[PDB]
Design a protein around this ligand. Structure first.
Ligand SMILES: [Ca+2]
Ligand SMILES: [Ca+2]
Ligand SMILES: [Mg+2]
Ligand SMILES: [Mn+2]
Length: 770
């Protein structure tokens, strides 16, 4: 695996230290302590956080006199060091907050026994090690913080004892960082940030420069490969958070101690979380990952002067704050831990220190649909509303595969709608990484909403190159994007030769921002078996033929609802009920019916119509009108008729009322059977009930709203070259102006058609008189 060729990001590796150690300084200085003591009164959140911190059993519990030996269990060794690190930090904090004698003495004894017992005898490279580098990252930060807090009040003797213990761990971590974490996944980054904290805490120590430098260097190999520039983490949402447990602290530590502010460079990893959040603010169960909340509140404070694409006026800080507090947290009751480190972390304290009660929660005001084509994720989204059943979310997953925690999920999609999790990724595993079932089922292509060729998963053209996106279109009435993967390309584990050569072009549309069309083009040099899979998450599957219905109940993840799906072409495909597990969090696995549609063909097409519905809503009337060269049908929902059409070539063909040369075409009618909206992929003409709507001298991709006879409005997808587009005006109405990207463009009117040269795409208004 090549760790240098992904389009990630890195920061300066130059170790900046202060002239002289100040303690405290990691989170705050001496002056701040009374403000931080007062903070508990600001609002109900700081109050609840104080209530948790000040009743911590790590204040009262007996410091254990029983040091464990090398041959004890890996759980007990873990919990010992976890507890010792926690005693030190919780007590060092409550000393600063209350001054109580007991707290300073406890913190001091715990710090004097920091990394005592068998840790340095044991081997962290051993699988399941009780002293694994991912655990002693948190320990190192817990002990370093406890010291930074209690150092002033130590004796000269105790200071030199505790400094010798921390400095040892630091040296050990420094020497074994690249041996414990030979590949640059979160097993390298987490302890590297741990070393970073230790280096800043003991800034005066002679080796602190070497320590910090390696810490930054090691972390940069994670952010270059596993992170995209646009913020995406390729180990998925669960391991992203797991990374944040050690990253967020270090980011603050290095600003507060050395005045190196990296919060601008790491900005996107927080914006990313907000862009992929579902209706209840959960990040998706994609790759080795559960559903996750994004702790964006803990960094909101640093982005008060940062602009975002997510609001017209407001600053990122207000969106980040809105995101966390507009999350359903019920999946993490009654405990409340979503970090994964619930033996080691001090999350109540770290939240208390980083939360800003002044930052106003502002909801994003832009279009919900976002295209993050660098990483290869795309979210169709009607609105930003929290816990609203009228919301529609589809994540469209097309990200270059990484060599850790990978799942075969290229051109897959998941759906959140009617407050329930519908069309599904089958999740991480039943419980853990080491289980058989994870390799045999969970990570496999068939566990996902993909199309396989002879069982082969769609994959990257070349290692660390994002699957190509085209024809991005966002509007009020129809969104659209196509992604391209190949079957005879690059994956893990590495596979060099294939019996054939083929590709998938999967387009997804968002008709009326209400339901979804998935239109697949499949090309191959040989006859092969195409297997389409559609998982309906944790639903009771019913239906016969090309139709299926997953019915959901009030569960831990959403409300009573149902998802209806139809697959075209009916007549050229067979439909196979199957049963596979779906798991959104550790331990909660269960079997649910999923559809396997199948063709044997060379070049062919599938189309899914997928419709979220409230419990008792009418099933739409869907009619397959597929023929030899044309796949598509009609949907009659809420008294309007939509018509979808796909083909493989620019050739004039017909389906229902459509006639076009376009490789894809959508049309919407109103109650009155008048064309209201339409979109085309690479068309030069569209007719509806025999009436021409537009023509062009070259192929153009665009969507247009024609319901207002005073103004036609929509968007034109990116353009390589100048196109003469000709749109038919309402009958006996002149054109007053045409606006593309807020600029007037030159227009003539010939035979009742507005005639424009368009040299770049973007939003278009055709403004009409009377
Ligand atoms: Ca993947
Ligand atoms: Ca939109
Ligand atoms: Mg290990
Ligand atoms: Mn998966």
């Amino acid at each position: 695996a090549n760790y240098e060729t992904y389009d990630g990001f890195k920061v300066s590796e130059e170790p900046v230290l202060p002239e002289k150690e100040v303690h405290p300084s990691l989170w705050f200085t001496k002056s701040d302590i009374q403000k931080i003591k007062e903070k508990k009164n600001e609002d109900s959140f700081t109050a609840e956080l104080w209530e948790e911190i000040s009743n911590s059993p790590y204040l009262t519990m007996e410091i254990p006199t029983d040091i464990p030996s090398a041959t004890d269990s890996d759980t007990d060794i873990h919990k010992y060091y976890g507890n010792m690190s926690r005693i030190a930090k919780y007590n060092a904090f409550m000393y600063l907050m209350t001054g109580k004698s007991e707290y300073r003495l406890r913190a001091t004894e715990a710090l004097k026994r920091a990394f005592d017992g068998p840790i340095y005898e044991m081997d962290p490279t051993v699988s399941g090690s009780g002293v694994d580098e991912i655990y002693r990252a948190v320990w190192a930060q817990n002990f370093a913080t406890a010291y930074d807090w209690i150092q002033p009040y130590l004796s000269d003797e105790d200071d030199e004892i505790i400094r010798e213990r921390l400095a040892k761990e630091a040296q050990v971590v420094y020497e074994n960082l690249y041996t414990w974490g030979p590949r640059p996944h979160n097993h390298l980054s987490k302890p590297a940030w741990g070393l970073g904290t230790l280096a800043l805490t003991l800034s005066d120590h002679p080796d602190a420069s070497k320590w910090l430098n390696r810490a930054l260097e090691a972390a940069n190999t994670n952010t270059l490969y596993f992170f995209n520039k646009d913020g995406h983490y390729r180990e998925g949402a669960h391991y992203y958070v797991y990374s944040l447990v050690n990253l967020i602290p270090f980011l603050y530590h290095y600003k507060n101690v050395s005045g190196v502010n990296y919060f601008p460079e790491y900005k996107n990893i927080f914006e990313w979380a907000v862009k992929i959040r579902n209706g209840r603010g959960w990040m998706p169960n994609v790759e080795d990952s559960w559903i996750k909340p994004a702790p964006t509140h803990m960094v909101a404070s640093q982005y008060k002067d940062t602009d975002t694409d997510l609001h017209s006026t407001a600053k990122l800080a207000n969106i980040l704050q809105w995101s966390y507090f507009n999350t359903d947290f019920r999946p993490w009751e009654p405990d409340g831990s979503y970090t994964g480190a619930s033996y080691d972390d001090t999350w109540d304290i770290d939240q208390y220190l980083t939360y800003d009660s002044t930052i106003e929660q502002i909801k994003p005001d832009v279009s919900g649909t976002v295209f993050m084509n660098n990483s290869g994720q795309t979210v169709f989204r009607s609105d930003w509303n929290f816990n609203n059943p009228n919301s529609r979310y589809l994540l469209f997953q097309g990200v270059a595969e990484a060599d850790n925690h990978y799942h075969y999920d290229h051109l897959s999609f998941i759906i959140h709608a009617e407050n329930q999790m519908m069309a599904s990724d089958s999740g991480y595993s039943r419980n853990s990484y080491g289980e058989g079932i994870r390799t045999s089922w969970y990570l496999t292509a068939e566990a996902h909403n993909v199309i396989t060729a002879n069982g082969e998963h769609p994959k990257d053209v070349s290692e660390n190159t994002t699957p190509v996106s085209r024809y991005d279109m966002d509007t009020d009435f129809f969104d659209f994007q196509e992604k391209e993967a190949v079957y005879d390309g690059f994956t893990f584990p590495e596979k060099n030769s294939y019996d054939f050569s083929g590709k998938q072009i999967r387009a997804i549309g968002f008709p009326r921002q209400d339901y979804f069309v998935v239109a697949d083009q499949l090309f191959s040099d040989k006859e092969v078996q195409y297997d389409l899979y559609l998982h309906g998450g944790r639903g009771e599957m019913s239906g016969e033929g090309n139709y299926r219905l997953w019915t959901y109940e009030d569960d831990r993840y959403g409300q009573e609802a149902k998802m209806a799906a139809w697959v075209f072409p009916s007549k050229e495909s067979i439909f196979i009920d199957k049963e596979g597990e779906v798991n959104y969090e550790a331990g909660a696995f269960n079997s649910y019916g999923y559809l396997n549609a199948r063709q044997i063909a060379k070049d062919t097409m599938f189309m899914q119509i997928i419709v979220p519905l409230s419990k008792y809503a009418d099933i739409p009337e869907v009619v397959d009108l597929s023929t030899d060269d044309v796949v598509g049908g009609t949907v009659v929902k809420d008294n309007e008729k939509d018509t979808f059409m796909q083909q493989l070539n620019n050739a004039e063909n017909s389906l229902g009322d459509i006639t076009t040369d376009a490789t894809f075409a959508y049309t919407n009618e109103n109650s009155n059977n008048e064309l209201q909206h339409f979109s085309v992929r690479q068309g030069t003409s569209l007719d509806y009930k025999g009436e021409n709507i537009f023509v062009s001298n070259k192929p153009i991709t665009f969507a247009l709203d024609i319901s207002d006879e005073t103004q036609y409005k929509g968007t034109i997808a990116a353009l390589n070259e100048t196109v003469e587009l000709r749109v038919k005006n309402p009958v006996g109405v002149p054109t007053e102006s045409v606006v593309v990207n807020g600029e007037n463009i030159e227009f003539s009117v010939e035979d009742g058609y507005t005639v424009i040269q368009v040299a770049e795409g973007g939003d278009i208004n055709i403004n009409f008189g009377e």
